[PDB]
Every structure is written in C-alpha cells, then in structure tokens.
Design a binder for this molecule. Structure first.
Ligand SMILES: O=c1[nH]cnc2c1ncn2[C@@H]1O[C@H](COP(=O)(O)O)[C@@H](O)[C@H]1O
Ligand SMILES: O=c1[nH]cnc2c1ncn2[C@@H]1O[C@H](COP(=O)(O)O)[C@@H](O)[C@H]1O
Ligand SMILES: O=c1[nH]cnc2c1ncn2[C@@H]1O[C@H](COP(=O)(O)O)[C@@H](O)[C@H]1O
Ligand SMILES: O=c1[nH]cnc2c1ncn2[C@@H]1O[C@H](COP(=O)(O)O)[C@@H](O)[C@H]1O
Ligand SMILES: O=c1[nH]cnc2c1ncn2[C@@H]1O[C@H](COP(=O)(O)O)[C@@H](O)[C@H]1O
Ligand SMILES: O=c1[nH]cnc2c1ncn2[C@@H]1O[C@H](COP(=O)(O)O)[C@@H](O)[C@H]1O
Lengths: 460, 460, 460
C-alpha cells in the first residue's frame, strides 16, 4: 500500500479512517476490470459468505456461487446435512436458478410465505415434475388465505428449453407480464427459471466452478474435538474449500489443529483465523495454512471490544497481516465489519484477496432466516453470531460453562426494497469495486493493491 | 505496557482510546487464568467496591467478599455502625448466603418490598429462628396488600444441612419449583440459603478471607480532624484494609495524614489517593502508603472537569501512576469511570492491581438504596457522589461554607433485568477479564500487564 | 305479551326500549328450565345461525347442532358442497368433537394457522388415521415457522376410546397438564377429541338430531330461478329444514315460491321470510309456510334503513308477527339485530320460537372466515352481508345490475379473549335466557311468553 506523504497517524485505521486517491488510468469501462481472485478459492469476485447459520444456507450457497462468490458452511453442521447441501449446490445449473416450487394442493398462506425464499417474485406450480402455472404475491392478495394454489395459479407463462441462449430468453420476456421464464428439461419437466435481470448476470458474472464444472462451496470446522476427522469427513462430503475458524486464531490449540489437517494432504485450500497481527499471520501459515482470516473485534462498539477490550481496526490489521502473508506466499481474508461496497474495496486495496461478509447478507431473500416486518411494516431479517461455536471448550458442568458463555446477539437487518436479493447486493458491491479500480488505474485486484494510493481524513 | 509501532499520540488516552492486540496464547480456558491480586488486599479478583454510601452497604460487603471482592465502607460512618457491619461480614458462611427473612405477621406490602433486598427471588419465613416457608413475588401478586405472610407462604421447600457439598445442593434443586435451597443449622434453625447458580459460584469464586477465615472488609477515612484516632478506631473495629481518600491526594495535608497512620504500625495495608501524576504516586508512597488510588476527574463532561478543568484521562493516569509505583515496590488502584468489563481489563493491562467500582454497582439488589421505577416501569436505583466528605474542611460560618460546597449529583443506574444482582455483574466483569487474558496469552494478572500490547484508535 | 299499565307508547319498540318485570317464581335453578323449541325445527336451544357465508360453515354446523342449535346453510351454495357439508355433519359424533388434524410433514406456519379453527387449543397429529401427538400454540412459539410438525409434536397425551362417558373423561384430564383428551375408535384410529369443558356441555346441552340420531342441519334457498327444483335438491341432500329467504318476504314472487315448495310435499319444516307485519306473516303461512322469519331492517342506522327508510323495530315486529302466527298455528324466528343474550331473551318473551344470530357468531373460532388481528393485536373476524343473493333478479344488462346493486358491507367482529369459541357464546346466551325464565317464573319457553310482563323505558 502507498500512503500520502505525512499520512502516518499515531493510531490504527478503520474503514472510516482512509480514502483512495485517484490515479492515472487507462481503464475506461467497469467491465474491463477482472475481479478474479488468486488465493486458490476459485472465485471470480472477491466476495465470501461468512460461516454463520443466519447467512450460510443452501439457497445462499447456490445464489452466491453462481455469481462467482463462495459460501462457507457454518462449523458443527451435521455431516448428513453437509452432504445433502453440497449435493444440492453442485447439481444446480450454472445459468438457470432454482425457483420456489408449489403443489396444486398447497395453501395460499404457504404460497405467500414460501415465495419470499427467492428473488424471482414468482413460484412455479409443479404437478408430477411438470410446470403448470405461476403464483405471484398479487395472486395471493384479496383471496382466501387457505385457498388452494390451483385456484389462483396463472396457466400462461413464458417457457424455453434449458440451454437456450440467455440473450434469447431475455427477448422472450420483453413483453411478458411476469418477468420469469420457466426453463424445461428435454422431457418437459421443471429445470428452473431465468429472469431478464438474471440473464444479464449470466453474461456479467462468471460462475465459480470446480474441476468438474460444479458450483463451488466451502465449509467451516471448529478447533475442538477431532479437527482432523471432521475436516477429513468434510472433504469427503464434497467441500471445495476448508476453513478452520476460531475466535482467537493465534493460540497453540489453533496452531496444532492446522498441523493435523495439513498432515492429511486433502488437496484443498486451507483458511485459518482469526488474527490481526503480522506474527499471528506468519504463525498460521507456517503451521500449514495457505490462507489467513483477518478480523478480531473490528467494531469499537461491538461485543468483543466492550467485553474484553481486545480487538484491532480492520484496515490497519489487514495492511499488516497481508504484508506478512505476501512475503510467505499466502493470502488474507478480511472478516468483519463489511457494511458497504466501500469496505470491500478498501479491504482489497489494503492487500486482501477476498472479503468475507456476514450480517449484511442476512437481510436478503436467500438467507435462511424468515422474512419479518417491524412496526413500520418494513421487511427485515434477524442476524446473529455463532457465539460459543467459535470459542474453545453433567448439569453442573453445563451450568458452570453457561455462566461464562458468550451470549447470542440479535440485530435487525432491514431488506432494501430495491436490493432485496443477495444478487442485487453483489451488483452493488462489484459495481463499486470495479469503479474503484478505474479510479486507481487497475485492471484487476493485484494491480489494485499495487497502484492504490491512500490517505487519512479527520473526524469531520 | 507496549504500544503498537508509531502509536505515540499527542494527547492522553481514556478507556475509549485504546484497544488490546491479541498475542500468541497457550491459555485455552477462561478458568485457567488466575485473577488473584498481589497488592495485599487479599482479593482473588480485581474488583474493588468504592467507599460510597450509595454502594457500600453491609449486604454489599457480604455478597462481594464471598465472590472474592472487597468493599470499602464510606468514610465518616459512625464507629458504632462500623463495628456492627464488621461483625456481620465476618460472621457469614463462605458459601451460604444470607436471605431476606420474614415474620408470619408481616404484611404482603413489606414482603414485596423486602424481597428485592437480595437476588434470591424468594424470602424465608422465620418463626423462632426456624424456617417454616418461602415467599416469592408470585405469592404477593393478586392478594390483599395487607394480608399476612402467613397466608401466602409456601410451606414446601428443599432443605439441606449447612456444610453440604454445593455440588450436591445444585442437583437437589433441579425439580424444585423454587430455585432456593434453605440451609439449616444443626438444631434445625435457619443458617442461610443457596441457589443453583450460587452453588456453582462456590466452585468458581474463592472467598476473600483473613487469617482466621472471615470475610475480608475495608474502611475509608477522611483527612479532617484526628486521622490517627479514626484510623486506629476502624482498625480495632475489624477492618482488613484502610483507605485514605480525598479529592486532591497530592497535597501536603494528605502526606501528613498518611505519615500519621503509618506511624501507628497497624499491620494493615494502607491505600491513599487520589493522584494521577507520577510525582503524586511517589509522594504518597514515600509518606508511608502501600497502595495509591488513581482517579481525579476521569470524565471530560463530569462535575469535577466542568467546574475546575482539573482531571486526567484514567488510562493515561493509571499507566503513568502504575509505572511510578512499580519502581518503589507499590501498587495502584484504578478508581473511576468504569462502566464495562473493558474498563476493568484495560485498567489491569495499564498496570493497576485492582479496579475500584462504585456507581455502576449501585444499580444492584445488594446496594443500600431503594429500588425505584421510571415512567417505563423499569427498575433502577439512584447513585450519588460523596461531595464534601472527600473534600478538605458561627451561623455566618455555616452559611458561607455551605454556599461554596460541592453539590450532590444524582445519577440513575438502571438494573439489568437479566443481571439484577451484583454477583451477575461480577460474572460479566470476570468473564471479560478472563477472556482478555486468553487473548493476550497471560495465565494471571501480573502476566497480563507484562504481555499486553495495545494500540490507539480514532474517533470513528 | 303483557305490558305495564299505561305502557302503550306512540311508537314501536326495539330491544333497547323494553325490559322484563320479575314475577313470582318457583323455578329455582337455570337447569330446571327447558329451552327446547316446539316449532318443528328440532332445536333444544332457541339459537339458529343465519344463512350467511360468513358464519354458515361446516365447523359451525357441527358445533352448533351438537349443542342443540341448528345452522342454515347459505343459499346458492353449490349442491355438491351441500352433500359434502351435510354428510360431514351427519357423520359427526353426538358427544365427540372433530379436532384440527395435522400431518408430520406439515409446517409450523400451517400448524399455527390451522390451530385457530377450533376452540380445543390443540391440533392432533395424524398419520394414516391414527393419532401420534398434539401441537399447541406454545409449541410453535420460539421455533422456526418452517420447522415440521414432527419436530414440535408432543408424543404424550391422555387417550380414551369412543363411547366412554364424558364424566370419566373429565376425571382423566383433571391432572392432565394440557386440557385435550384424544378419542379413539375401537381399532385405534382417531375418532375425535373431548375436553373438560366439552364434557361438561354434554350433560347440559341436548344435541339436535334427526330421526336417525344424526346432527340436524338446515339450508336456505332464494326465490330466483326454479325454486321448487332447488328446494327438492336441498331436501334430497339430507337437509332437515328449508328456509326460503328474500329481502322483501311480503311479495307475490315470494308467495309463489312457497306454493312451489309446499306442492312438492318434501316432509320438512318450511321457513319463510322476511316480514315485519301481521298481514305479511299471515300471507306466508297461507302460502304453505309453517315458520315465518321476522326481520326487515331492524337496525335504526343500518344500510337498509338508510337507503330506503323501510324497516320496523324488531321487538314490535316480533310481537305483532308472532301473535298473527299464533292464531294460524305458526311460529316466527327473530332474525336480525341480536348482539347480547338480552336480545335472545326479549325475542322469546315477545313470542318468537327461535332467534336467528348472524354477525355476532362471525367472531368465533368455528366461523369460516380466517382469524385476523388489528393494530392493537386483538383477534377479530370480518362479517359481511349476503347482498344480492337475497334480492330478486347481455353485458349492458349485467352492468345495469351492478350499477344499482347493493354493495357488500364489511364489519369487524372482535373475538372475546374469554369467549373465543362459539360454544362459549351459547353458554353466555343460554345462561341469560334460563335466568330470564327464572325471573319470570317460567319452566320453558312457552311459559316465558305466557307469563312475561314487559315495560318501556326512556332514553336515559
Ligand atoms: O420451494 C420450496 N417448496 C417447498 N418447500 C420449500 C421450498 N423452499 C424451501 N422449502 C422448505 O422450507 C424449509 C427450510 O428451507 P431452507 O430455509 O431453504 O433451508 C424446508 O422444510 C424446505 O423443504
Ligand atoms: O458470536 C459472534 N461474536 C463475535 N463475532 C462473531 C460471532 N459470530 C461470528 N463472528 C465473526 O463476525 C464475522 C461476521 O461479521 P459481519 O460481516 O460484520 O456480520 C464472522 O465471519 C466471524 O468472524
Ligand atoms: O432479611 C431481612 N429481614 C427483615 N428486615 C430486613 C432484612 N434485611 C434488611 N432489613 C431491614 O431493612 C432496613 C435496611 O437494611 P439495609 O439496607 O441492609 O441496611 C433495616 O430496617 C433492616 O432491619
Ligand atoms: O461527589 C463526588 N465527586 C467526585 N468524585 C467522587 C464523588 N464521590 C465519589 N467520587 C469518586 O468516584 C469514584 C467512583 O467512580 P464511579 O465508579 O465511576 O462512580 C469513587 O471511588 C471516588 O473516587
Ligand atoms: O383439520 C384440518 N386440517 C387441515 N386442513 C384443514 C383442517 N380443517 C380445515 N382445513 C382446511 O380448511 C379449508 C376449508 O375451510 P372450511 O370449509 O372453513 O373448513 C381447506 O383448505 C381445508 O384443507
Ligand atoms: O347483505 C345483507 N343486507 C341486509 N341484511 C342482510 C344481509 N345479509 C344478511 N342479512 C340479514 O341479517 C341477518 C343477520 O343479522 P345479525 O344477526 O344482526 O348480523 C340475516 O339473517 C339476514 O336476515
């Protein structure tokens, strides 16, 4: 990184403390920028979904991986659930998305509830595998909430075979009342849907795929119990990337856990965290990890900072941790505090190869939580932390532990009425990051870190 | 202390200005950390209750000392009341707590008011020293306000002899409708009570006891009048610790007072304050004090700072006074401005041997003040400062002095509906400090100050 | 009817205008009063549910008929739905009620929604016709709304075979924690449920049953089209009583409708309405009707009165119409304006053999409408009128009808948090009516009309 002459403050820098100075550029268009990563994750955009049960669901895994991102499944998920989730994600089409499906015998109440699990705005009525109609929220309005789907389903819809050029599907939906094109398998059964906006993303985002052409997906593992056996079985389940996650990554028990996984030679990229120091970053890489997760109490007003006083501003942490990782051939992930595309761009300029986002993505249609409404009828979803699942660990013992546990904090994450889907947030984030590179003169993320010039601003 | 490279700001730092950078750690469990102090106070935890009439009651002394703490009785308290208080605290069982007691002829009005004197959630009805029933807030609801305790008491309760293993008492109380175990003397009379959570606390917190195994106790004394006679009168009354307390500790009249008490050779630790300068710590220890209490106008917008402009940020004050005290083999107490476990952890990292807590603990069941409710019906208590009792001191004379006196400031300290008792606040504080040491890599408090690495953060 | 001396006002009387003067009575208990009717309807309580789609569902038909009432199915309801509704009611147990049933694959969202269709407070989980557990509203709280019933169902429940007397079932639920007893057929299949309150009503209410011992049910028909052909189809479907209903019962088109139904000799009671005059009542009986439905715009400020000014106070209408029916051997139903048990008691004293209740019964669990919540989160239901389905009836023609047609008026019917089920409303009504007879000195409804002494009160 480069700072303006004299910009060496006597403190650490948060995302709000720094700004990017424009430089000489020959990159005119945002589309000329290549957002592919070089950390072995296989992502085409520098966005990683945090390993939190409030965010890392099956629909989020499919939706994010299709647009070039990756979702890390939360640690301690039962291996049966991991296998079914991986099999679901790696069976999805690289262009066609999975819609909400309904049976003719389902109620209107279920139809309205189950609909808001995707950003398509319409559900496909299925009878013996075949699409027979579409259900919208307008079809559910003004009708008996326990009526059957058959009574409100619209039998007319735009259809096209799977494999059709998305530009042609875009044409078929130009004068369509419902912006959903139902894609059919050769035998006529349901294969998925494609919207006009979804077809656009097909030509803008490159799907993150493994060697077999299947959508990528990652999964997390804690440092208690048998780390080797769990990470081994997690690799057997089809995970394309393994993340060893703990609150204090710079500890001997985390150091030992990385040695156990590395000694198995699983052939998967290894992330380890969290640390905010150069020494801790070097220690995790020497243990056998190739990627380091950066982020320990980034919020001055958050739980970790106010309970213990331990933490570090995320921007200064990444700058120090990335430089330590760069000389060892490693990479760093910026984990925590991401609320705007600015934080994604600033984290990458500081040296990160990927940016991990948690609570921000919880307020989306694709997150596992249920869609809620506040006193003003504004849509929102509840994010919450992993609490003891990132901590080192008979009625007495449980209660003895229970006294000193970390509580589960819940936060109101409002849904943007114009950006309700996680794909809209990916459009929001990547548009800013691409335009950031045009300001600095970078055609990719490596040139971003190389040519970025940074400055410090006052509290004004 | 060590600061991050370049973190030498051009100003003094308060608790909000600094953060703790994690280091390599082999301390996995919070319970592996030793919170014992080395300043001679006899505490196994770094929490001191301030010498304030709003906080320093008799029930406060019993409850805090059992969990390893120490309570300083407010100065100028009559010597008769001091003796009565000492005899209570040193007559208590190291595990069994003193419950609220009720007579069968008492009113429901009294029972409801007396119930909130402890955090047990139930009061034991006593007849001729014998427990005959329990009274809860549920028994007081919906009944006549002037009905007798006899009419609402629950005659069924779990009982066990005093001295029984607290691990046993815990399992006896699972299927009891009231989570209060009534402990009995050999002759069947009331000895105290023990809750499920209180039974767990017996195996987590070590009682702060004197050489005879009696709960420890402190004492404060002003600098007006005969300091030697007052210090001796409280020492013979059973105090294990003496606090010479005033607003401006760096004064010649203060030095005379410490020399007067030290020349008595009472054999007890001498605490003296308050100063926030390196010279102030040197002069007070040279006078004969072993512990220097640090804290003068720590709040920028508090009364002392707004009236005189005199003060100093508490963290920079402590770290300077801690550095000076070490060179003379003394210790320092961080007194003032503590509102979160972060403040306790940073005070210890800065070099203080103990953290003095006052107004924060006023909003607890164990504080002497009355439980009040706001316009939202939420519980709170009124904390207030000592005013002139920490200041050096015909009818014309009475008026002129009273005219310039510092007024009593009142502040509302809300009770946490989940942490209504002071023991819950001690759980909150120690959990953070224990977690802090695991982040720093220290197994005890001296190692905390030795291994801590801190940084400065911006206003963002 | 007898009025006090001088109580001959120069106007007609509503239910608010009159009162009952107590008389000498030897009827001590409410249980000594016989509420059975003599009008041929077969009801054992003087309560009939109006032919309104807002109230006349199958859950209401079963619940009211079991307690001695009868429900009139709304006119123009398809004949296929008639047979399905009648066959359901005619197959219900005279003591055992039909609970809400759930599949282990049903969602918690559907479980909470379906719960409010009965007053049992719990739904029975069914697999292949056999009960496996119950789901309560408490079971749905705090869990994911898309969790499965199988994950929250309680496997423990009191069960008893069908045919057990309600007294012993009452005892089995005395110390059962949740007041639902599952009734099973001899083969172990689900026969229904019986609650402690439902067991009590079995000894209080006599079910209204046909000659085969099956619950009674009535149905309404309009005077448009082929009234005779429709009326025969309703009789063949199993209806026990037919109601020929129109807005203006005193018209030639209504008279021809009665003759058509009478000439078919269906063997059922013939109800005709609506009129509010002695001549109108006598004309309908001469046409072939045995029961005349009384009620034309009884509300002073209702829609009918405000559009046309046509109507009559219901109490004076019933008095005049009943006396006219008495001389011709007929009976009258009080239809409209019923809001309290007072209206039922006053209608019977005025000479009506039955009281028709509509919008009041809409705010019940058993009504067909879905349970709603207002801005204060209070439960309520929407009542609404029959509009053109009670009125005499190309594109230009259809538009002319809609232009001058009567709109559908909607009204919010709040649920009593203590009287949520329609059986509680029947308990509220019959308690007052039985108490009314004890004040008058009547052992039955004929004695009520025979011994009643009435008075008029002013607006005070
Ligand atoms: O399109 C759909 N049709 C039917 N059930 C669905 C659909 N999407 C999600 N579900 C159900 O919703 C629940 C939770 O789904 P998740 O939140 O996507 O994991 C499970 O019971 C799923 O079967
Ligand atoms: O319970 C918790 N307490 C504190 N930090 C947490 C907890 N659960 C997850 N985290 C961290 O916070 C990150 C998400 O931060 P976010 O992107 O600001 O929501 C995760 O990736 C974890 O590193
Ligand atoms: O357990 C108890 N039973 C009855 N009175 C009590 C109890 N604890 C305190 N009190 C009374 O409460 C008042 C103040 O007590 P303090 O707040 O402990 O100083 C005095 O009148 C005490 O006698
Ligand atoms: O009236 C007063 N004015 C100023 N400082 C006071 C007063 N009373 C007590 N103090 C100091 O404030 C400390 C308590 O600080 P707290 O815990 O932040 O309320 C005490 O231990 C005293 O050192
Ligand atoms: O116990 C029940 N289980 C499941 N669905 C029910 C139950 N009772 C009523 N319904 C549904 O309610 C609707 C009929 O409404 P109704 O005619 O008012 O009872 C249909 O969608 C039924 O499947
Ligand atoms: O749309 C309508 N307009 C006017 N009267 C109606 C309508 N629907 C039903 N009614 C009458 O009102 C009665 C119910 O009155 P309630 O018991 O006071 O609600 C029914 O039995 C009908 O006689």
């Amino acid at each position: 990184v480069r700072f303006l002459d004299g910009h060496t403050p006597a403190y650490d820098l948060t995302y709000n403390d720094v700004f990017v100075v424009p430089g000489r550029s020959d990159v005119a268009s945002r589309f000329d920028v290549d957002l592919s990563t070089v950390d072995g994750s296989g992502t085409t955009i520098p966005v990683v979904v945090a390993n939190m049960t409030a965010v890392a669901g099956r629909r989020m895994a499919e939706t994010v991986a299709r647009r070039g991102g990756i979702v890390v499944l939360p640690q301690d998920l039962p291996i049966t659930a991991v296998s079914e989730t991986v099999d679901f994600v790696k069976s999805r089409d690289l262009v066609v998305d999975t819609p909400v499906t309904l049976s003719p015998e389902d109620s209107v109440s279920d139809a309205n509830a189950l609909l808001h699990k995707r950003a398509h705005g319409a559900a496909v009525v299925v009878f013996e595998g075949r699409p027979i109609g579409l259900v919208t929220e307008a079809n559910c309005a003004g009708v008996d909430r326990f009526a059957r789907v058959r009574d409100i389903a619209l039998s007319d819809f735009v259809t096209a075979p799977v494999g059709t050029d998305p530009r042609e599907v875009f044409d078929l939906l130009e004068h369509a009342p419902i912006d959903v094109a139902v894609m059919t398998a050769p035998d006529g059964t349901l294969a998925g849907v494609l919207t006009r906006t979804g077809a656009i993303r097909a030509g803008i985002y490159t799907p993150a795929v493994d060697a077999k052409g299947r959508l990528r997906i990652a999964a997390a593992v804690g440092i208690n119990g048998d780390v080797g056996a769990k990470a081994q079985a997690l690799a057997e389940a089809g995970a394309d990337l393994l993340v060893i996650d703990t609150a204090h990554g710079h500890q001997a028990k985390m150091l030992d856990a990385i040695k156990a996984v590395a000694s198995l030679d699983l052939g998967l990229p290894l992330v380890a965290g969290n640390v905010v120091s150069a020494e801790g970053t070097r220690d995790l890489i020497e243990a056998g990890a190739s990627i380091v997760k950066v982020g320990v109490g980034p919020g001055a007003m958050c739980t970790t900072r106010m309970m213990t006083g331990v933490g570090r501003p995320q921007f200064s942490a990444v700058v120090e941790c990335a430089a330590a990782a760069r000389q060892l051939g490693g990479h760093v992930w910026a984990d925590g505090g991401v609320r705007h595309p600015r934080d994604v761009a600033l984290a990458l300029a500081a040296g990160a190869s990927n940016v991990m986002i948690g609570s921000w993505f919880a307020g989306t249609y694709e997150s596992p939580g249920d869609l809620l409404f506040d006193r003003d009828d504004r849509p929102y979803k509840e994010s919450y932390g992993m609490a003891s699942k990132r901590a080192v660990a008979s009625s007495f013992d449980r209660a003895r532990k229970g006294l000193f546990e970390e509580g589960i904090s819940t936060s109101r994450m409002s849904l943007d009425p114009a950006r309700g889907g996680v794909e809209d947030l990916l459009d929001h984030i990547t548009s800013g990051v691409r335009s950031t590179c045009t300001y600095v003169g970078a055609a990719n993320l490596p040139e971003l870190h190389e040519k970025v010039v940074l400055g410090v601003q006052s509290a004004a």
